[model samples]
Target: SEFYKLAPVDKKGQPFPFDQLKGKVVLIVNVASKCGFTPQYKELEALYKRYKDEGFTIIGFPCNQFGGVTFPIMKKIDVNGGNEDPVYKFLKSQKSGMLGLRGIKWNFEKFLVDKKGKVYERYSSLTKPSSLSETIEELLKEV
Candidate 1:
């Protein structure tokens, strides 16, 4: 995937070029504010706060198809459809989820990208954010 080719706007509608994140491990997730897993935001935020300065960042791409969120949310985007965002399109193309499915199963589905802008791993919505610390740490440590 050409990670740098992704150019989505933030909640403020400001340009967000993925190219700016080069050399940082990134976690991108399809988020829904009202889902049962919405509370994972806490752990996600905690993870962000913990490693952000260490070259790690998390971006939440909300989709109202399931629900919605307020803070730290990117513009709503389709995870699976003709209107799916290009960023998500590249992500799913890089790694499929459970049963080799490329479609996002639910809110909170996660995709971890290594520092070099390659998809590292995909996690289902049911996987807790806290469980990714080890993998994230490994990526962060990579030169």
Candidate 2:
């Protein structure tokens, strides 16, 4: 509960207890159904299958603002402006984009948080899910 003041509801319409993901490497993404990056779902799933057992998980947030594979899909949300979800606000405050641009650049924007519940890296739609493999592996190794 240090930084993640989030208690977002899962796609299943269930709410998390805020620290539900503690002790794992979490990849949180803002995605769109019709965005070009929508196809990245396959790659995301590939990564999920490979590392989930190693304490790595991906949480997909559907954002019509731009914009997956299988993972916990939160209800659709806005990733920018006043109506933006609070989770994005917390994450952006934790890890801004290149040059410190805080708002989500576009759909499929990702925030990677380590086991300690700290945001480690943020990626744009251009950074494919598979590209984060090595770093994810490293995070999973953290005790």
> Top lDDT: which candidate number?
1
The lDDT per prediction is 0.84, 0.81
| Residue-level lDDT tens digits of model 2 in 23-139 | 989999887756565468888889899999998888888887652366778877788999988888789877874675578877777889979898998888889999999999899
> How well is each residue in 17-100 modelled by candidate 1, as lDDT tens digits?
889889999999888845576468887888888888998888899886764332356877788888989988899889974566
C-alpha-based local distance difference test score of model 2: 0.81
Poorest lDDT segment (10 consecutive residues) of candidate 2: 64-73
lDDT, residue 137, candidate 2: 87
Error of 1 at 13 (Å): 1.1
What residue runs in model 2 are displaced by over 4 Å at the alpha carbon?
35-38, 97-100
Residue pairs clashing, model 1? none
| Model 1 lDDT, full chain set | 0.84
